């Protein structure tokens, strides 16, 4: 009972590309049927081949709300959208990600964490925005030297968003780099940042194999 993705790629499918609203997750499949750029808002999807290998055959697949939009993020605006992710002639964003911005001219220090109580592996995804100029780094995050730290029991990494004006893709001068990890049952993942964080909005718990 494999998967059928149609126009969407796994990058588009797993990130929640609004062009993929038709696709509903079924509990299991033996193998994925793609028709492969799926990244709505351009960027580098880290370990994309590694992720397609883990998602080849699954069981007990589930899509749950990991970080509620209207509570997990006090003192931060969460409704950040972009025209690169259009949805019926209107700007939108990934259906599984939140793009955190300033609130009242303030991006306070960030802290939040998730505990894997699903008793399965929880696939958690996030992104790192790489703006195109120093002016829009301050206007959205109020800090030139931003840091993002993702730490769990089995994965610890610290990102520094660098300001660089790349060639336009989807009519956008900046990128968002995508990253993921697997959270064991009973494990806790902790996000801390002060800017350029694309925090998880939903996540997937799954039995691999």
């Amino acid at each position: 009972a494999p998967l059928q993705l149609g126009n969407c790629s796994v990058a588009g499918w797993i990130l929640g590309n609004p062009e993929c609203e038709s696709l509903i997750s079924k509990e299991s499949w033996s193998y994925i049927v793609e028709t492969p750029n799926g990244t709505c808002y351009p960027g580098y999807f880290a370990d994309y081949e590694e992720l397609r290998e883990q998602l080849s055959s699954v069981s007990s697949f589930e899509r749950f709300e990991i970080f509620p939009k209207e509570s997990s993020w006090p003192n931060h605006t969460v409704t950040g959208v972009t025209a690169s992710c259009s949805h019926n002639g209107k700007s939108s964003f990934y259906r599984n990600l939140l793009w955190l911005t300033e609130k009242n001219g303030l991006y306070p220090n960030l802290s939040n964490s998730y505990v894997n109580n699903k008793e399965k592996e929880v696939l958690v995804l996030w992104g790192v925005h790489h703006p195109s100029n120093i002016r829009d780094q301050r206007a959205i995050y109020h800090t030139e030297n931003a840091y993002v730290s993702v730490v769990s029991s089995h994965y610890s990494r610290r990102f520094t968003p660098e300001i660089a004006k790349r060639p336009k893709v989807r009519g956008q001068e900046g990128r968002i780099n995508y990253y993921w990890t697997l959270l064991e049952p009973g494990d806790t993942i902790i996000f801390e940042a002060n800017g350029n964080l694309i925090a998880p909005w939903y996540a997937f718990a799954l039995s691999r194999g």
Partner: antibody, heavy 122, light 114 residues
Framework: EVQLVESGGGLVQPGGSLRLSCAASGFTVSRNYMSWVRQAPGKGLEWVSIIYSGDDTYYADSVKGRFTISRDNSKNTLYLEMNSLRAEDTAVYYC????????????????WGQGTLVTVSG | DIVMTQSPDSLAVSLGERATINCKSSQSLLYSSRNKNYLAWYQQKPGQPPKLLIYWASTRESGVPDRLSGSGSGTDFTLTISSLQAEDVAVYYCQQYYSIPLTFGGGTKVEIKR
């Protein structure tokens, strides 16, 4: 095979306008990075402008709003229409190429033109 | 505006000696995604246009001799001529195609002692 033939330079009075051309053969200009790089006499190299992908354009802040880059695919040519030329614009302008692969990352200037000189004087 | 700085401003060594051209960038030329350094090295003989010798900091283009090589990763990069020949007398610019404005270095004039 891959050449770049430039033409359009010469003498122009301050405030005058002038149009530079770059004839190409060996690669499609609509499918690679095309850049202008001027070099003031006895001074270092300086980038000027680019055009790429769906005719998106970047410029340097020193010539922005005054120069306009463009291209013509049926003629396989690069253009740099210059307006409101100033004395410090007196430089040999070069034609530049880059292998636009995925269009995500930039590329260097692998193939160059032989250079034409624009003198801003009256 | 990444500031590309070269060292020295003029290099004169004997034929067959060993010459190094050092280029320090105002910012890291590496990408968090992969491990490729967007720095390029160009040659400009007198009266000629520039000629790309090295891209991706280390990789050479076709037709470029083996004695040329580019090293470095991050903010510090180096062009080196192991056995300097006679036809190598030219100016060498390091240039970043990291971000835009694309900026070259000041230039390094290499000369032969005889």
């Amino acid at each position: 095979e891959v050449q770049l033939v430039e033409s359009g330079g010469g003498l122009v009075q301050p405030g005058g306008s002038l149009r530079l051309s770059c004839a190409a053969s060996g690669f499609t200009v609509s499918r690679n990075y095309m850049s202008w790089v001027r070099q003031a006499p006895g001074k270092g190299l300086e980038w000027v402008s680019i055009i790429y992908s769906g005719d998106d354009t970047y410029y340097a802040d020193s010539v922005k709003g005054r120069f306009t880059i463009s291209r013509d695919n049926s003629k396989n040519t690069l253009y740099l229409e210059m307006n409101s030329l100033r004395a410090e614009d007196t430089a040999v302008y070069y034609c530049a190429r880059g292998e636009m692969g995925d269009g995500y990352y930039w590329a260097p200037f692998d193939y160059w033109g032989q250079g034409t000189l624009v003198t801003v004087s009256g | 505006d990444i500031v590309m700085t070269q060292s020295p401003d003029s290099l004169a060594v004997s034929l067959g000696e060993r010459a190094t051209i050092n280029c320090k960038s105002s910012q890291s030329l590496l990408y968090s995604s992969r491990n490729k350094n967007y720095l390029a090295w160009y040659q400009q003989k007198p009266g000629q246009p520039p000629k790309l010798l090295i891209y991706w900091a280390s990789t050479r283009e076709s037709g470029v001799p083996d004695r040329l090589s580019g090293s470095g990763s991050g903010t510090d990069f180096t062009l080196t001529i192991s056995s300097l020949q006679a036809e190598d007398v030219a100016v060498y610019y390091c240039q970043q195609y990291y971000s835009i404005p694309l900026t070259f270095g000041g230039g390094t004039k290499v000369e032969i002692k005889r």
